[PDB]
Design a protein around this nucleic acid. Structure first.
Ligand SMILES: [Mg+2]
Ligand SMILES: [Mg+2]
Ligand SMILES: [Mg+2]
Ligand SMILES: [Mg+2]
Lengths: 196, 208, 209, 195
DNA sequence: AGCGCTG
DNA sequence: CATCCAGCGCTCGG
DNA sequence: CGCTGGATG
DNA sequence: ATCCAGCGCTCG
């Protein structure tokens, strides 16, 4: 749905549902295993303090979502002082076993402001995400060739004029080198490329 | 199992480093890495950031550029958001959602010991994808040369230093050899191969 | 047996560091030391210098100032002159060596990083036998930075303070003798720390501005 | 002796003895165990390539000199390509067991120019050796600035009321509150008492 | 130099 | 009672 | 601030 | 067999 969130009935009038009002619209619905749906293919699995204290009851649902095709789960988990001891074990499971995204929250209040952002990010085009959306090598090659002992600022360009690639430079005889840089620096270059 | 740590981590990560050695039994080497925290495998780098660093919006664009640098050298990037030693913002949530949308994995840690634990778990996964770091003095000039190659990581340069008997042998290798010996992707071996075969033209530079 | 290595040594000492761990079985920690290479004990620091660094007369006065700084915090200073990786002597080089000898700075010579690590280990053993070895294993981070702010004390002295005093107040109320024993410093050095913590600040000794 | 070196007979006309000519004077003498004497109390024990290849025959003499009172030995050793393998074992012995000074040389030529310096250093007064020969207010400001809550401005106000680190450390929250806010008082108090 | 917190 | 700046500590990057 | 190669003896 | 000039190198 557009500009909307499909929600599980159980969040009717919760602090989460309350703080999202006006910011974002909630279509409630029954029989849903996941807590929310941001789009058709991205859902949320809210794990509460109660869920995490009890044991590994939360996991059943997480397994279903990951093993569903046509669907991805974002797990949001209540990381309090009470629960923090159980969080490592959950995160290992959620992130490293199942491969799913996990976001801790102190409270439902925080999960409100977080879920608004996830929805703003989904709606955003992938280009305007800076971690989704060619050069002259000449400058780099000067610096690479300057790592050869004997070769500085002045000898680097002279060598790349006669031997125009690193490969050709690497294959150059002492004789060919002597013409450009003289006997000593020729030996240094030759030694560098061939020392086993 | 080997892991490389940036030298800068001794100013804030001493318990991460020493746990990794002691508790987890990894070989841990503190290295002069330029622009990354933990190299966990040939494919995976891990950035470690305190909550405060993540909250501080002065750090947002700098972090994003750091992740962009790391994207050119690594296929898998993980951020570990570590609780500060002994209050949440839109820009913090915004950063997290940005990272999610680019498939940058996020992990949360309450202390340096738990960070070390996550680093170890991440180490194990990568070992099972046969991209783990394999390493053990006359090869020092060669390393600095390989590190000068654009958009390659310290471990890629180290692999080159370890695997090619000589620099010439490296520069005459095939794309496939570079892929295997330097332990890089096809795309990445292609970038290295093009670089070494690139026809320098002095007239592409300015004069004075 | 523990040894602290300056972080800067990873730019030239990687085989020293890893030998120490692997071959010699020391606990080796790479530390943000300010102005020294290897802290080998509570009393002994080791400076590592290549032949080239020692030959280069540009480095002479700077080296001597380095040794002078180290003299205010350490009773035993050793220089290891390590051969450059794959040497003509100068008067200035011989002059430096004779200067160091005359001030009882011990000199050792090493042909490679492995041999440097071997000397560091031997030096570690001697010091262990003088019961001045480093004894360490951290929500005491503020406290460390405070102790490091005390003039003319080394990183290990500040670490000892952090480890041994239950609180900063307990440190600041300690006797000279307690500081000597808990911080593992000499009488003279405990005296300097005690005077510092009891020093009567006077705003009028600073400029007005 | 003055401006001089007492020398063992065996160095008569050696490359060492030749290069010291004009620079420094050599009084030769027989029956000496050590190679040279710079002063009456500082001697040299030259260990040659031959000495170091053979085994541990050199050591006997080193032990005598160290175990002499009224005498100190500087061991100079010929570190060549040949000998380099044996040098670690010697240095361990000379420097770390016996406590004596050890100086490697490639050749006698180098030992010439080295021994001239040792003699120039001995003759020099110990003051002009730079490795032989302040208000705390600024430091105390910086120390107090390591206390969380305390910066440039609060540091001097605290040291005006609590003029030493000790007194600052013993200050009550009440005494702190008068100088800084309730919050920064708690920070300071917490810092000094946190176990 | 800009940013968050305290009276 | 709820705010609004202003001064400060802190972090960061020149 | 040392080293190399080259112009000046 | 010798000054120096240009360069690479190190360091601040
Ligand atoms: Mg799925
Ligand atoms: Mg070069
Ligand atoms: Mg004696
Ligand atoms: Mg402070």
């Amino acid at each position: 749905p557009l500009g909307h969130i499909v929600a599980n009935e159980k969040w009717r009038g919760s602090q989460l549902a309350q703080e999202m009002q006006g910011k974002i619209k909630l279509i409630f619905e029954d029989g849903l295993t996941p807590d929310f749906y941001l789009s058709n293919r991205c859902c949320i699995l809210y794990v509460t303090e109660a869920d995490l204290v009890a044991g590994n009851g939360y996991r059943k649902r997480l397994v279903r979502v990951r093993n569903s095709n046509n669907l991805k789960g974002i797990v949001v988990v209540e990381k309090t002082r009470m629960s923090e001891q159980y969080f490592p074990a959950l995160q290992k499971f959620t992130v490293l076993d199942l491969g799913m995204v996990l976001l801790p929250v102190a409270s439902q209040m925080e999960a409100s402001c977080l879920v608004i952002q996830l929805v703003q990010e989904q709606t955003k085009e992938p280009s305007k995400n800076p971690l989704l959306g060619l050069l002259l090598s000449e400058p780099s090659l000067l610096r690479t060739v300057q790592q050869i002992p004997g070769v500085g600022k002045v000898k680097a360009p002279l060598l790349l004029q006669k031997f125009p690639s690193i490969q050709q430079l690497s294959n150059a005889s002492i004789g060919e080198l002597e013409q450009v840089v003289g006997q000593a620096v020729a030996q240094q270059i030759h030694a560098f490329f061939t020392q086993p | 199992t080997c892991i490389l740590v940036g030298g800068h981590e001794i100013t804030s990560g001493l318990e991460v480093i020493s746990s990794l050695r002691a508790i987890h039994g990894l070989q841990v080497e503190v290295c002069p890495l330029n622009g990354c925290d933990y190299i966990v495998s040939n494919r995976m780098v891990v950035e470690r950031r305190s909550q405060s660093e993540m909250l501080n919006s002065v750090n947002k664009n700098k972090f994003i550029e750091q992740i962009q640098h790391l994207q050119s050298m690594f296929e898998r990037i993980c951020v570990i958001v570590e609780k500060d030693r002994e209050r949440r913002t839109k820009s913090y949530d915004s950063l997290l959602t940005t990272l999610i949308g680019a498939g940058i994995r996020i992990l949360f840690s309450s202390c340096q010991e738990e960070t070390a634990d996550l680093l170890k778990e991440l180490s194990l996964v990568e070992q099972r994808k046969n991209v783990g770091i394999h390493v053990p003095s006359n090869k020092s000039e060669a390393l600095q040369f390989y590190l000068s190659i654009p958009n390659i990581s310290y471990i890629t340069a180290l692999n080159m230093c370890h695997q090619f008997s000589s620099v010439k042998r490296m520069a005459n290798s095939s794309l496939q050899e570079i892929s295997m010996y330097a332990q890089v992707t096809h795309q990445k071996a292609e970038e290295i191969y093009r670089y070494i075969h690139y026809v320098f033209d002095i007239q592409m530079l300015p004069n004075d």
